[PDB]
Amino acid sequence: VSQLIDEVDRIASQAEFNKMNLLQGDFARGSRATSMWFHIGPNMHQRERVFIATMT
Amino acid sequence: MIINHNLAAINSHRVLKFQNEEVSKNMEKLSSGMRINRAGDDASGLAVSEKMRTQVN
């Protein structure tokens, strides 16, 4: 059991897409660190936001 | 009629050469199989691609 929770927190703190952590909680609903957006339009404000909660 | 210079031919030659260079670029892209071959085209994309190659290795 201890090994399995160790693995779980390892995935939480080591998952990475583009040298940025995802499951740590940097994109949660109440993210005090940062927010990330997906610019999916050809104009100034055509964008959207995606939330990734804490998974530690 | 001005015969000492051929301005229409000059314009045709200019457009021909500046499309020949881009057809050569497209040919090199098709032969290589990837859109980012020479530095300058999508520098940020090249940087992220290098980072992802490091990550996959």
How many other CB atoms sit within 10 Å of the CB of residue A48?
9
Method for structure elucidation: cryo-EM
Q: What does DSSP assign to residue A4?
A: H
DSSP 3-state of A47: strand
Assigned token pair, B35 = 């859109």
How many other CB atoms sit within 10 Å of the CB of residue B37?
14
- This PDB structure is determined at a resolution in Å of 3.2
Strand boundaries in B7-54, DSSP class E? none
H-type alpha helices, chain A: 2-14
Which is nearest to A25 in space by CA: A48, A34, A8?
A34
Looking up tokens 């290098």 gives B50
| Residues of chain A contacting residue B52, judged by C-beta atoms under 8 Å apart | 18
User: Dihedral sign, CA of B35, B36, B42, B48?
Assistant: positive
DSSP 3-state of B57: coil
Looking up tokens 């660190």 gives A33
Q: Which residue of A has its CA nearest to B47?
A: A18
Q: Do B51 and A19 touch (CB under 8 A)?
A: yes
Q: Which residue of A has its CA nearest to B56?
A: A17
Measured CA to CA, the distance from residue B39 to residue A35 in angstroms comes to: 31
**Quick check: A53 and A29 in contact, CB under 8 A?**
yes
